[PDB]
Design an enzyme around this catalytic site. Structure first.
Site, mmCIF file in Angstrom:
data_model
loop_
_atom_site.group_PDB
_atom_site.id
_atom_site.type_symbol
_atom_site.label_atom_id
_atom_site.label_comp_id
_atom_site.label_asym_id
_atom_site.label_seq_id
_atom_site.Cartn_x
_atom_site.Cartn_y
_atom_site.Cartn_z
ATOM 1 N N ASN A 184 -7.657 -17.947 -10.502
ATOM 2 C CA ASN A 184 -8.988 -17.388 -10.267
ATOM 3 C C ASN A 184 -8.944 -15.981 -9.647
ATOM 4 O O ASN A 184 -9.697 -15.095 -10.051
ATOM 5 C CB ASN A 184 -9.829 -18.338 -9.410
ATOM 6 C CG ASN A 184 -10.434 -19.490 -10.221
ATOM 7 O OD1 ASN A 184 -9.727 -20.264 -10.874
ATOM 8 N ND2 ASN A 184 -11.750 -19.618 -10.153
ATOM 9 N N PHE A 186 -8.354 -6.769 4.090
ATOM 10 C CA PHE A 186 -8.063 -5.341 4.220
ATOM 11 C C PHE A 186 -8.301 -4.627 2.892
ATOM 12 O O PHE A 186 -8.885 -3.541 2.850
ATOM 13 C CB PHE A 186 -6.613 -5.209 4.648
ATOM 14 C CG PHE A 186 -6.135 -3.792 4.811
ATOM 15 C CD1 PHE A 186 -5.753 -3.043 3.697
ATOM 16 C CD2 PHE A 186 -5.965 -3.252 6.084
ATOM 17 C CE1 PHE A 186 -5.238 -1.769 3.838
ATOM 18 C CE2 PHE A 186 -5.453 -1.976 6.241
ATOM 19 C CZ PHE A 186 -5.091 -1.226 5.116
ATOM 20 N N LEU A 195 -8.648 4.055 2.400
ATOM 21 C CA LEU A 195 -9.557 4.655 1.437
ATOM 22 C C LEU A 195 -10.454 5.723 2.076
ATOM 23 O O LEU A 195 -11.160 5.427 3.051
ATOM 24 C CB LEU A 195 -10.426 3.556 0.780
ATOM 25 C CG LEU A 195 -11.445 4.016 -0.270
ATOM 26 C CD1 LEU A 195 -10.749 4.604 -1.477
ATOM 27 C CD2 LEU A 195 -12.367 2.847 -0.667
ATOM 28 N N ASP A 227 -5.182 6.736 -5.627
ATOM 29 C CA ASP A 227 -4.629 5.400 -5.795
ATOM 30 C C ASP A 227 -4.683 4.949 -7.260
ATOM 31 O O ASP A 227 -5.100 5.704 -8.133
ATOM 32 C CB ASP A 227 -5.304 4.401 -4.843
ATOM 33 C CG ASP A 227 -6.733 4.040 -5.244
ATOM 34 O OD1 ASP A 227 -7.358 3.277 -4.464
ATOM 35 O OD2 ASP A 227 -7.227 4.468 -6.318
ATOM 36 N N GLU A 230 0.809 -1.219 0.000
ATOM 37 C CA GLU A 230 0.000 0.000 0.000
ATOM 38 C C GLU A 230 0.843 1.269 0.000
ATOM 39 O O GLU A 230 0.345 2.331 -0.353
ATOM 40 C CB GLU A 230 -0.903 0.051 1.239
ATOM 41 C CG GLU A 230 -1.884 -1.083 1.353
ATOM 42 C CD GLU A 230 -3.107 -0.940 0.454
ATOM 43 O OE1 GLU A 230 -3.939 -1.865 0.460
ATOM 44 O OE2 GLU A 230 -3.275 0.086 -0.263
#
Length: 162
Positions: free
Chosen positions: A132, A104, A32, A20, A11
């Site tokens: 996936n 998270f 966020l 971002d 991050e």
């Protein structure tokens, strides 16, 4: 390493509001603020999150407070959830860190919705789980932030973070 060091790698740490990879206003370690394009809306959200007037800038200590709160929400989130908990309990230590990281990033409901990947993880089908995961909007909209988590699910080592 630990979940805090891991998430700081994915991050980054920024003390002023920034956009971002998806164009969303973020601050601290992956906190966020809003999906609104209005910078003043992000500033208002920040002031609410901290409880004071920040004018778009926080201290490292405030960033770490938000980070603690956010990781705690992810962990408690997994451990009370009937879908996520039995999978978390089934994983090895390193992959548990990857689980917390994913939650998270995506939120509890987002992760709990990927029923196939959860089953694949519970069944040790690591390669299948990663392929996936690489089809998700989560990964595809922002590969650099998710790539190491996917690799970590594939390998069960800390190699992607060294």
């Amino acid at each position: 390493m630990n979940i805090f060091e891991m998430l700081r790698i994915d991050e980054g740490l920024r003390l002023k509001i920034y956009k971002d990879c998806e164009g969303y206003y973020t601050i601290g370690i992956g906190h966020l603020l809003t999906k609104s394009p209005d910078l003043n809306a992000a500033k208002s959200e920040l002031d609410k999150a901290i409880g004071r007037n920040c004018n778009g800038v926080i201290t490292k200590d405030e960033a770490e407070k938000l980070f603690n709160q956010d990781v705690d929400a992810a962990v408690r989130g997994i451990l009370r959830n009937a879908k996520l908990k039995p999978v978390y309990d089934s994983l090895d230590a390193v992959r548990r860190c990857a689980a917390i990281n994913e939650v998270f990033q995506m939120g509890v409901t987002g992760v709990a919705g990927f029923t196939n990947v959860l089953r694949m993880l519970q069944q040790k089908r690591w390669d299948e789980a990663a392929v996936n995961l690489a089809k998700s909007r989560w990964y595809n909209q922002c590969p650099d932030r998710a790539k190491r988590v996917i690799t970590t699910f594939r390998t069960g080592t800390w190699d992607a973070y060294k």
